[PDB]
Structure formats: structure tokens, C-alpha cells
Design a protein around this nucleic acid. Sequence first.
RNA 1: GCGGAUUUAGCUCAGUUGGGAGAGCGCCAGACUGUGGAUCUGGAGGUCCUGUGUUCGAUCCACAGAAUUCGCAC
RNA 2: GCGGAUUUAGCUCAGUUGGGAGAGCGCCAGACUGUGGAUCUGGAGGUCCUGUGUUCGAUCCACAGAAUUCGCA
Lengths: 238, 238, 238, 238
Amino acid sequence: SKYEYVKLFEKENYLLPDTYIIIRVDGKGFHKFSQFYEFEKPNDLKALQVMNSAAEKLMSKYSDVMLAYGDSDEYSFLLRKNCQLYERREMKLTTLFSSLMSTYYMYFWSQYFPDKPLHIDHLPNFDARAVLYPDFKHIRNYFSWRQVDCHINNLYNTTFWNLVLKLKMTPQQAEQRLMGTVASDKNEILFKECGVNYNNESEMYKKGTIIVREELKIYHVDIINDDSWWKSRPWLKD
Amino acid sequence: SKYEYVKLFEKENYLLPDTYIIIRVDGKGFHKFSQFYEFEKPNDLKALQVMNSAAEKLMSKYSDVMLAYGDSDEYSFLLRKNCQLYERREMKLTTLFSSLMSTYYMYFWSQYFPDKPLHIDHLPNFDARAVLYPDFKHIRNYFSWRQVDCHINNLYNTTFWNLVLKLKMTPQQAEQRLMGTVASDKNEILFKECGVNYNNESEMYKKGTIIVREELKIYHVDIINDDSWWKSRPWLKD
Amino acid sequence: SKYEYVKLFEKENYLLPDTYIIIRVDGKGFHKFSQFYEFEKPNDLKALQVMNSAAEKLMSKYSDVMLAYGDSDEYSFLLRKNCQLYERREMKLTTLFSSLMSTYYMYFWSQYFPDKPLHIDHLPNFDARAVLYPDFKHIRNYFSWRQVDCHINNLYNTTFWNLVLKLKMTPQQAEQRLMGTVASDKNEILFKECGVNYNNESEMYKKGTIIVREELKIYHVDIINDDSWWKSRPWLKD
Amino acid sequence: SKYEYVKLFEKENYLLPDTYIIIRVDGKGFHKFSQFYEFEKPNDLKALQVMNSAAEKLMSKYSDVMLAYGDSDEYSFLLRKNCQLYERREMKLTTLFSSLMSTYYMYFWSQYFPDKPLHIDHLPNFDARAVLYPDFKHIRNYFSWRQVDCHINNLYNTTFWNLVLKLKMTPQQAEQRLMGTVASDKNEILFKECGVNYNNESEMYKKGTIIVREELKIYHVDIINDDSWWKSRPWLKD
RNA sequence: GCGGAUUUAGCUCAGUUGGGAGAGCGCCAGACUGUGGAUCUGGAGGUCCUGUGUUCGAUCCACAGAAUUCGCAC
RNA sequence: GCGGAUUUAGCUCAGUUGGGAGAGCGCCAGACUGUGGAUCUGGAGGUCCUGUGUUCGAUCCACAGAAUUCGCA
């Protein structure tokens, strides 16, 4: 053909071999999304169950995924360093992960929320980015970063939404009240003013969600300081 | 934070400025997809209408998309050379496009096919790639390439399936019949042996689908040799 | 062989076809270099001829180089859109250009300065970077940028070195004297305090060096506003 | 400035952190270079001493280089995984290495060969590529690969040049003679026909050259199987 | 895109309805001698592409995903 | 992750009910002049981060998405 020459303008990027690959997918404008479909605040259980369902099915579909961690509207997938999926073409991996997460989310939404059919202008869309890590310690520190982020965001949102619902404050009022406040102050505000003991909050909300290949098992525990949890799973390293 | 340092391992790729951008999305294993949901052969109208609906909605959402061409399980989107969407980040554009096409396809499928609800193991997924073209002549030639490819492939499937249906041949028999045949030979085989006049086939089947920003208008015309069609639409160039 | 596998960690980068290529080479620490070998200030003529000789020879060797502009310790080379040199492999182009400029500079230095044999710890080194530009207008604007920067740096160096040499100021003293000063002030300082008419300085010093493929001709002219200079050379565009 | 905007078209590439970097430089058309300056065959000691001098000086100039291995017209440099030279910018590293190796080669050439002044059309140029390796085992395997390649190439050149020089053959005759020949066949040809025992060849010629930071020490030993050679130098991993 | 064929040790290839994995070259060690060549002896290396399903048991059987190659076709 | 402020001519800052965009500099040319200095005239360059609407009309207003910067950690 006299037209195929344009194919020469395409440029592929193969991700460095024998390197750990993290693919992180993130909900596009899921704040507005959470508002449109009237999500429970601070945390809506079933929506998180949809997220976990999509992630788990995806994980079941692709064996190279050793571990997955999700919270709020985000999910991180760890691919074994020796992954050869799609010859490690970055675009294939990221666009496939985003496509899969979006479609599976739509499906499981149709399963968990039949009362709230999806509207064409507020469909769940995900972006996806690939990140390379040469040593496992960086993987540990990454998931540590994500879990710390989950802890901070959950504490803030629980305090905020308890201030809004129980103390009937305005979002602006709750926002100003939390200004310059630290973890101890948020816990004290929740317990004394809202009558809520944070430590008694669901483990899933405060710790996020971990899916690990054992069998596929789901945990909601601290992985930041618990070295034995990692050490007992050496196949994560391989 | 002692963990945020891992964020430094990320690499962004900004697409060269003042360049025409083509993002092509492609259905993942849609032959098998067409089999599972028992698509009509050679061409199933309603499915193609799902594709076109999804693509048109997508084009409607992003004003930077000047032109789209789709056929079978593929769709190409032209973004104007001075586009600043997501600061011209390749990953954002591609993962977002795959996600959008996927979700819109899922939505419109429930609309056109209420009789065939989607199965979790056969959801429509799309990959996506970004290609840069510095001169409009290469864009013209690109879409020319896509239309020629559509013509050849359609001619193949229509001839094959007419050989299976009208002459009651076995797939291997029809395939053996098509060895060393060219477009003209396939046309002559269809007309003389199967009694089907190709030129009378649906225009969408023979030319594919064009969505162009005018209002958004859909065409099923030749864009390869019709220079005036392009010349009459200078806003495509800039 | 059981060791050849490491070849898979290599990454090639082919520069986008049908795009103008600019390769800019720049002297490594040529201020300290100028100090060690006792360069005349503000401008040492013979050094500039070494630069120009190296650039001209390099350009003579590779016909794809259509235009070159050099000043101080930098030089810019324009390679035509359909250049296929080293299959447009970026790395080959850049390392080759840097190696060539360094070696030719060493050679022509050995020719112009036999009195000052080069010392191993002060050899002329060059870096090299490649930049892609999709439209010729951006090429014009690039070389315009380079000539403007050349004017700025030359004016600064002449004023600075006239304040240090013609007067008896310290380099830091002159630096502080020129702080927050503009072209008008520099001109006025040269005139009133140093008794130097900037405009009467050599044209090469104020405008830089242009090498054009016509035959290779060397110019010291304005290319910023002179449209006719470019328009009279359409082969530069092709 | 209204022209500085072109600066936005540059794209820099920062190498993945915590990864071992190998920068390999290789002589451009050094077959022709070897012919032009009438190099001794198969191996010219003084030329190898020029290469080695250049490499040692370069390594001496940049403390980040932990190990270097060179042979024939190529040299490989290992940079420790946490190196921050030029912020791990690929272009700067490679073009700088090419420039340095080229200039140093010119200088030491002027020192070892006062009898053979360099001709402008045959100055020594080097290309350079950077390769990332996430694990040290790959470093060991890389240098192993290069040393094996050295063994093969040296055996070939010694057998070949003994066939042209000693048996007074034409290069094409030797080329055809070595077609389909294996190491054993080459050894027997040298031994029986040329009266040459390969094992008695200089250790530098058959093993290549190793420069290691200990002090900078030079070795001509096997590094493929001698694990202790690496193990006794743990600072290479760090 | 359509179809066939293939994926097991470092390289080339076996193998068994469906049962516990091998040979030649190459590599390392020792003896031997002409040396890293020749012969001989010894030894090392493998997620049998990645998952799933059935089964007491999968390299094999069924399905799916990835990769290699050759045909036909622009 | 949560919030404040910011993005307007090449640079630096105003900036407006909601209506018609500017200054200093920079920069091109011309007259006279020490020089493309100053001084003098004319002129250019602004998609005011990007889209939609309310409107007879949008730089400010209302919705959506993005970027720089500093806090709270």
C-alpha cells in the first residue's frame, strides 16, 4: 500500500526488563462522581465493594499481578519483576488496565446498585500510569506511602463528615474547624464532640484494601511496619 | 513524608507541541467477542451503531477532537496540532480514551442489545496509542490508510462468508478458494459464483464511518481521493 | 551465548520522521577554558575561527546540514526534514556530533595555536542536544532566539570587559555595576565611561556566524527581521 | 524574549534512579582507522595503550565510574546505581563521554605516536550509548558478555591475520577459509598451519583490559567464572 | 486483520492414555597433552510460555491470555 | 491527601455593574541625532489557562477540567 508509511511515525516504549512494575489506576473526577450517585459519607461500603470486585476480577484475569492495594478512588497493582505480558509494552499495559477497570467497575456497579443505573454523562473512568522500581524496598515504601495516605484521608474525612452530619456544621465551618488540627485533635474532636471512637471504625476504612495472591486473599491490615507480613510472602519478591 | 520519595521514579512524556495528534483505540480480541455475542456475519449493523454512538459521544465531550474514523473494532481520533488537553501528556490521553470508549461502548450496548446483557468474562476492552504527525498530508494519508484497510478487510469477510453461505463451503474450502486472489478477483468471485453484487452493499460497510466537526456530522463517503472534501474543511488543518 | 540477553536492556530512540532537526553543541566550561589558555577578552578572534573552522568542516562532511549558526562557545546545526542520517537515531547523531566538534576543535586549535599546546586537564569538550521542530516558522524563530541571545551575551561581555580592562574594576565590581542594567544603560556606560562605540565592533562579534549551503558561504548578517534572506533560500525549507 | 518559546520543544531524559548505569563508547569505522594509520595486526599494542590511557584518565576524572572494561575499539563504563552526575541526564552523560574519550584519545595519540600525526579526515570519533541495569547480576553478566565477545573476536583476528600474514593469503581467502569454522578448527589452523599456540598470546589481547577502582588498578584476568574477583570487591554493588 | 505451525537445560531438539523429566553440542572441575585445541572421566544448569478447569496425579487433556514463525492478502 | 492565593502584550503589575482592554519597559521603522542610547512620531505583538451558559454583549459572573506557589501533615 502507498499509505502504510505513516505507521513509521508510531513509537513504542518497552518497560525495563527484570524491574518491578506498578500500574496505578485512579478514578477521574470521582468526587463529583460520588456526589452525583449520592454516596454515603464519609465512607460508602458498597461502592468500595464494587472497586474491590473489579480489582479482584482483573487480578484473577492476569496472573502476573501479585498484589493489589486500593483505597478511595485509587488502586495500585504490583507486577512481578519478570513479567513478560505484552512484551512489557507500556501503552498496552496502561490502556488495558484502565479499560478493564472501567468496564469491570461498570459491570459490578450494575450488580451492586441496580436501583441506581449509570447515567451516560457520569460513567466511571480511570486513568492509569506505569512506574518502574529496581529494588523491592521501594515497593514496600510505595505501598507504605499509599497506606499512610489512606490513613490521613480517612481520618480527615471521618472527622469532617461527622462534624457535618452530627454537629450539623456547614462544610465551610467543618473545614475552618479542622484548620491547623493534628491527628490527636481530630481523634479528640471525634470522640468528645461526635461521640465516635475512630479506632472502632471499620478496619477497611482506616487501613484500605489489600488483595494478595496466596489463592486470592483480601486483608485490611497494617503493612507499613509489619515486616513479617512481607517476609512470609517471598513469592512477592520473585 | 519518608515514603513520598518513590514519587520521583515516575516519568512523564509530553507530546511534541504544534503537532497533529492521532489517538487510535482498538478492540481487544473482538473476533472472539463477536463470536460470544453471536455477531452477524459479515457485518452486524447494531454493533457498529454501538461503536459509532460511543465514538460520537466521546467526540462530543472533547472539543479538540476535529475528526474521527472508525470501522470494525477500531477508531482513530484527530486532535488539533495546538491542543493543550492534559498538557499533551501521552498517558493521560491514551488511558482516558481507552476508558471512555470502553465505558461508552458498555452503556450503548445495554441500549441496543437489551436481549444480550454483558457477561463479566466478555466485556468490551480497548487499547489506545498516540501517534504524532507534523504535516497535514500525513494525516490525510493516515485516514486514507485506514479506509483502504477497511475496504480490503470488508471485501475479505463478505466474500468468505458468502462462500460459506451461498455455495455451502467449509471455512477451509473457502479460505483455499481465496488463495492468491486480489480485490478484483474477490469481487468477480462474489458476483459470478455467489451471486452478490458488492457495489450494492451498504455504504457504511464499504466506506466505514466518519465523524467530523462542522455541528457533528457523520459520513460514509470516500475521503482518499476526494481532495475537495478536505479542502472545503480548512479548520481540520488548524 | 548465555550472556547476550543483556542486549535486551538497550533502548533506541528514532527521531520523528519528516521533522526539522536541530543539533546544538556547546562547549563544556569554556569560561575556565578561556581563562587557562589566556583568551583575549571580551572576544578572542582566533578562537572563534577555530570554532567556525570545526563547524564548517563538520558541515562540509555531512550534506544534510543545511544551515549552521555559531557564537561564543555554542553552535546550532539544522538538518533537513527528510534526513536519514544514522536512520535518525538520536543517540548516534548526538554522540557523533559532540565527538566531531571536540576533535575538529582540537585539530584546528593545534593549527591556530602552536604556541599553546593543549594540556590534558583542559581539553575542549562539547555536549550536544537534539530538538525537533515540525514547522519552518519555528526554525526561523529558533535561530532568531539564538541571534538575540548572542547580542545580549556579546553586549554584556563587551561592557563587562571594558569596565574591567579599559577601566580598572574587579570582575565582581563590574558585575555589581551592571546589575539591573539594560541595553541602553550598557551602551551609555560603554560610551561615557569606556569611550567605546559598540556598533563599531566587528560584525561577527555582534551578529554571530552563519554557515549556509548555497557551496558553503559564511555570513555575519541579521537573520531575525530580514525575511528576504530566508525566502531567497527555499531549499532550506526542503 | 518573544523567541525563547522554542526552548519548550526540548525533551530531556532522566535515567531511572537506583539503577546501575553502563555507558559504552565505540570507535566509528575504526576498521578504516586501523587501516589508515597502518595499525599492526592482529593487535597493535601502542593503540591499545592509547585507548587504555584515555579510559584511565576519564575514569580518574569522574569518581562515579567504579569499573571499566575495554577491548579493540570499544570501552564500557560502570556507574554506581546512585550516581547523580548531570542529574542522570542521558544526553549529557553520553555526549560528554564521547567528547572526552575522543579528545583524550587524540591527546594520548599525540603522546604515543609523534611519528604519525593525525589527519583531519581520520580523527578518532566514538559513539556512546547508556544502558540501565536494575540488578548487579546483570552487571556481572554484561561484562561477562563483553569478555566472551572479546575472546571470540580476538581468536578470529589472530587466526585470520596469521592466515594473511604467515601463509601469505589474501583477506578474502582467509575470510572464506574461516567460514563455518569453530574455535577448535581455528586453534588447529593456528597450531598446525601457522605454528601458533593461541594460549601463549598476551593476556591483555585474549582477556581484554579491566580498570577497577581499588587506587585505579589494571587487570588482564578472567572475570566470567572467578566469583571471588567480584565478591572481594563489594563496593562495586554500592 | 484472517489461517496454519511452534514455546522444555546456555543453543538445537526429544519424550509419556495422564504418572516419578532426557540426549547431542556448549559450560565448569580433574586427569591426560599440543593449549582454552584432541580424548577420557566427573559435575553443574530447567516456573517443561503464564493462568485456570477436570483428576488421586497435568509438559501433555479442555478453555483462555502472551510471545515466536510461515503462508495468503493491502 | 485537605485549604489560601495566583495565571492578562516578550517581561513586570494593575485591572473592570457584566459590555468598548491598558501602562511602564522591551521590540521594528522613520526624522533629527553619540549608537538599533536618550529624546520625537508611527506601528506591531494580547486565543486575558482552556471549554459551556445566564446576556442585546463577556477579561470580572455561574458550571466543568488544568497549571504555578505557600500553608495545614
